[PDB]
Amino acid sequence: SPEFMENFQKVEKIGEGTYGVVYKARNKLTGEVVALKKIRLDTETEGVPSTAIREISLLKELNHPNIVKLLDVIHTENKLYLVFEFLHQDLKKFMDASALTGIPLPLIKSYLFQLLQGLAFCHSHRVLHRDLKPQNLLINTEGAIKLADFGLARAFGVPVRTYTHEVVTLWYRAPEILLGCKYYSTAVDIWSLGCIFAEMVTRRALFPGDSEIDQLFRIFRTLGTPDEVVWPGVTSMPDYKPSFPKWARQDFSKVVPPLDEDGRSLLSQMLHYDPNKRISAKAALAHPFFQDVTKPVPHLRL
Ligand SMILES: O=S(=O)(O)c1cccc2cccc(Nc3ccccc3)c12
Ligand SMILES: O=S(=O)(O)c1cccc2cccc(Nc3ccccc3)c12
């Protein structure tokens, strides 16, 4: 049954992502509240890159309890309206709301666990997120959290425009990307999630840089400047410069004080320099940190 924009009552703008703005809408025909992501695509060179649509089709294929539910796709001349399930809020706004007490360990541990489940599902389906941050992770009242606002590959890039203020996307960006390697892996999402793990425990972003080189130095100041020992092939990296300052690695009892050995074990495995040593989503799930994992309800509010 065909859906149209005239079917949907807009109620309010719930935020803006990388590729448009997202609206809280009310399907007048069901009374059901949904989220609409508007997408102005550019039939520029006619679109249809054939790399772009191939990846997007892998995205629509994904059905998992920890990936936001795409209900319908509405085409109108030069526009695309993505109909999503409506969800309560994002992880960033949640972390801000309770930055005064922190998120209880069981809820941190639960969110982390579900995110690894969602990523593990993506990674076995040849999908990467590429832009994992608290902003674009969505929670509900059940106690669930879901991946949203996926990134797109190959530099540019599917035929859409963005309209975005300067990134804070750098904060969660894996080092191999910051040193310019051409082919990266699923390990880039593990890094980002690892950073988010730390932020949930400390109530603050691990590596808040204002530029690519500033981002690398913040990583270096904390985990130490990597060499060929810790990371084979690092010195030959396209954007590696031997002029890099040498920093000694800090210890985790100071970087993430409330973490016990199991959390630090896992965090260090997620924050490994070398992508070929960095723990996978599927393997992170089997980690003794998640031995007593539960599904707590979030203490929610506006
Ligand atoms: O494949 S669709 O399901 O349409 C789709 C769904 C969700 C997001 C999309 C983003 C760009 C292009 C699409 N395809 C497209 C193809 C031809 C014309 C216009 C858009 C997207
Ligand atoms: O919105 S997301 O939350 O990433 C998303 C979530 C779930 C399924 C999706 C399917 C196709 C495109 C998406 N986003 C997309 C990315 C780039 C351009 C156009 C659409 C999907």
From Swiss-Prot:
Sequence positions that bind Mg(2+): 136, 149
Keywords: Acetylation, ATP-binding, Cell cycle, Cell division, Cytoplasm, Cytoskeleton, DNA damage, DNA repair, Endosome, Kinase, Magnesium, Meiosis, Metal-binding, Mitosis, Nucleotide-binding, Nucleus, Phosphoprotein, S-nitrosylation, Serine/threonine-protein kinase, Transferase
Effect of residue 19 to F: 2-fold increase in activity
Positions of post-translational Phosphotyrosine modification: 19, 23
GO function term, MF aspect, one: protein serine kinase activity
Reaction equation(s) it catalyzes: L-seryl-[protein] + ATP = O-phospho-L-seryl-[protein] + ADP + H(+); L-threonyl-[protein] + ATP = O-phospho-L-threonyl-[protein] + ADP + H(+)
Record function comment: Serine/threonine-protein kinase involved in the control of the cell cycle; essential for meiosis, but dispensable for mitosis. Phosphorylates CABLES1, CTNNB1, CDK2AP2, ERCC6, NBN, USP37, p53/TP53, NPM1, CDK7, RB1, BRCA2, MYC, NPAT, EZH2. Triggers duplication of centrosomes and DNA.
SUBUNIT field: Found in a complex with CABLES1, CCNA1 and CCNE1. Interacts with CABLES1. Interacts with UHRF2. Part of a complex consisting of UHRF2, CDK2 and CCNE1. Interacts with the Speedy/Ringo proteins SPDYA and SPDYC. Interaction with SPDYA promotes kinase activation via a conformation change that alleviates obstruction of the substrate-binding cleft by the T-loop. Found in a complex with both SPDYA and CDKN1B/KIP1. Binds to RB1 and CDK7.
Protein name per UniProt: Cyclin-dependent kinase 2
Originating organism: Homo sapiens (Human)
